[PDB]
């Protein structure tokens, strides 16, 4: 169907892309393929796709969707990534309703782990939403869609007004120059709210009504929500970005430290405040006809070509 892939069910839709499910024909692995038709793209949108690809090449994390191969024809551009066979947070909330604070805490820890990692590599997501927080086979978070993401310099103001309206920070609606991480922290507050409530803090019939709600900053806090959880959300959803919690303050919040001691979370957050070759895989690739030194050169040069994908997929 497409190169070495057998395409099937559509699993996602973007403004200019269609994400279809696919199988690697040589590795038998299950992957996702973002399909983009370059013919319907302006030069501003063509740059935003190439920026997304470069940003994804920098992010290798257990809770971020992993890019495997980038293929580009005269009129098409395909991004082959890992497939999350468990679903997405939005579908999970539609099927089962609000999560218990214990279940929500585990997923929220996984989200902040991946968002903190991004901010360490100087990248802001700018499109965190329930429908973009996928779930693997074990129901573990894998953040997807870095189309609206951008590189930032700590202390710089960004000027791209983008994001999912129900999760977008007030500054974005107001068209103000903003601090990247502070915009992601607001989205995280909405994500935490919707995880424990099964509903949005700011909602409406139209985008105009939704905007008025977000700019008000007022939101109902349900009876079932703990005092510790309410404090965390109220300190993330703050109209003044300077008065919002930082990523480090979120990770050390009383609600976050609740329940059993989580040293695996501490190890992942400490890694963000700062590998060898699988010789068995390299031998198997040599048997398929693929050159040993050419595979190593593809791996070290971040080519994300046929040799990179077969190595990365085989290491699973």
């Amino acid at each position: 169907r497409i190169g070495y892939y057998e395409i099937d069910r559509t699993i996602g839709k973007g403004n200019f892309a269609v994400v279809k499910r696919a199988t690697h024909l040589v590795t038998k692995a299950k992957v996702a393929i973002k399909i983009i038709d370059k013919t319907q793209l302006d030069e501003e949108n063509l740059k935003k796709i190439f920026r997304e690809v470069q940003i994804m090449k920098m992010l290798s994390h257990p809770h971020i969707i992993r890019l495997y191969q980038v293929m580009e024809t005269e009129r098409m551009i395909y991004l082959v990534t890992e497939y999350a066979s468990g679903g997405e947070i939005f579908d999970h909330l539609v099927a089962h309703g609000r999560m218990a604070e214990k279940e929500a805490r585990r997923k929220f820890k996984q989200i902040v782990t991946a968002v903190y990692f991004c901010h360490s590599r100087n990248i802001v997501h700018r499109d965190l939403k329930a429908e973009n927080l996928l779930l693997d086979a074990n129901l573990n978070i894998k953040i997807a869609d870095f189309g609206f993401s951008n590189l930032f310099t700590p202390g710089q103001l960004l000027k791209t007004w983008c994001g999912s309206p129900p999760y977008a920070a007030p500054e974005l609606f107001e068209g103000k120059e903003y601090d990247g991480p502070k915009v992601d922290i607001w989205s995280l507050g909405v994500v935490l709210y919707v995880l424990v409530c099964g509903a949005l803090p700011f909602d409406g019939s139209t985008l105009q009504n939704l905007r008025a709600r977000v700019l008000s900053g007022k939101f109902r806090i349900p009876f079932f929500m703990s005092t510790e959880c309410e404090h965390l959300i109220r300190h993330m959803l703050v109209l003044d970005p300077n008065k919002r919690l930082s990523m480090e303050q979120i990770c050390k919040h009383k609600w976050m430290k609740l329940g059993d001691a989580d040293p695996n979370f501490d190890r992942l957050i400490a890694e963000s405040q700062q590998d060898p070759l699988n010789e068995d895989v390299l031998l198997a690739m040599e048997d398929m006809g693929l050159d040993k030194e050419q595979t190593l050169q593809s791996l070290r040069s971040d080519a994300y070509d046929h040799y990179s994908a077969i190595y990365s997929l085989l290491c699973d």
Partner: single-chain antibody, 236 residues
Framework: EVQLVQSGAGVKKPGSSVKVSCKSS??????VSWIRQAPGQGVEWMGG????????NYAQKFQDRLKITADKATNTVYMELSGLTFEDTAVYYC?????????????????????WGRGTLVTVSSVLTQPPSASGTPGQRVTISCSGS????????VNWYQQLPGTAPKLLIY???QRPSGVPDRFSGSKSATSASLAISGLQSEDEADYYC????????????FGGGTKVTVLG
């Protein structure tokens, strides 16, 4: 043709929780809302899908005790009301929002309930101003007023429902003046600033029923508000 099949009636002890189902049995993606009606009382919106933005939207009154879920695979929608009290004894209906297929984030829905389930009687055992009653002689014209505020009628379309005894409310007027298929031209709607009116011309004995006006209220995260219900009585 397409029908909403609800679960059977039940008795719950106070403090417990009840789960009601609603399965679509026809030519299928929908926007099911849950509406309850206490014995001899008016209809009340509890929650359901009302925007393209969130997984569910609940009425403030029910936010703390309602859970609304859906099984896409089987076309079944669920409702779970917890911490039941004697005040939760009511008939629970599931209703589909007509213009769901038109929702875009920019398109403003009318929030008219196209299809209603037959109702589920759950028993616990151990905003819009409408006149309580209206009357007229056959052949005459009866008009029901429905006043509200600028957040609801002032900003949205008004829909009217007719409820016959022992049956679920039925859409009578949608989008202020429109009539669904089957509704005669005798019934007509109107809306001016914050008030709506329903005119029943050439009144017949068959029109003796309760009439409810409804509109989307933009207060809070949005909710559908209902009138108290007008009991039209057709004289001799």
């Amino acid at each position: 043709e397409v029908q909403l099949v609800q679960s059977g009636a039940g008795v719950k002890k106070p403090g417990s929780s009840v789960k009601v189902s609603c399965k679509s049995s026809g030519g299928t993606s929908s926007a099911v809302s849950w509406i309850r009606q206490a014995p001899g009382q008016g209809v009340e919106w509890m929650g359901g899908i009302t925007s393209i933005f969130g997984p569910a939207n609940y009425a403030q009154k029910f936010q703390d005790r309602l859970k609304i879920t859906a099984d896409k695979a089987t076309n079944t929608v669920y409702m779970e009301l917890s911490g039941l009290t004697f005040e939760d004894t009511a008939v629970y209906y599931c209703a589909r929002v007509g213009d769901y297929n038109f929702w875009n984030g920019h398109y403003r829905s009318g929030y008219y309930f196209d299809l209603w389930g037959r109702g589920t009687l759950v028993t616990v055992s151990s905003v819009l101003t409408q006149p309580p009653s209206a009357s007229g002689t056959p052949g005459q014209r009866v008009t029901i007023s429905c006043s509200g505020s600028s957040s609801n009628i002032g900003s949205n379309t008004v829909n009217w429902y007719q409820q016959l005894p022992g049956t679920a409310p039925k859409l009578l007027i949608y989008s202020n003046t429109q009539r669904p298929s089957g509704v005669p031209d005798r019934f007509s709607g109107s809306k001016s600033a914050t008030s709506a009116s329903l005119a029943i011309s050439g009144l017949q004995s068959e029109d003796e029923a309760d009439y409810y006006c409804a509109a989307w209220d933009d207060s809070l995260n949005g909710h559908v508000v209902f009138g108290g219900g007008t009991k039209v009585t057709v004289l001799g």
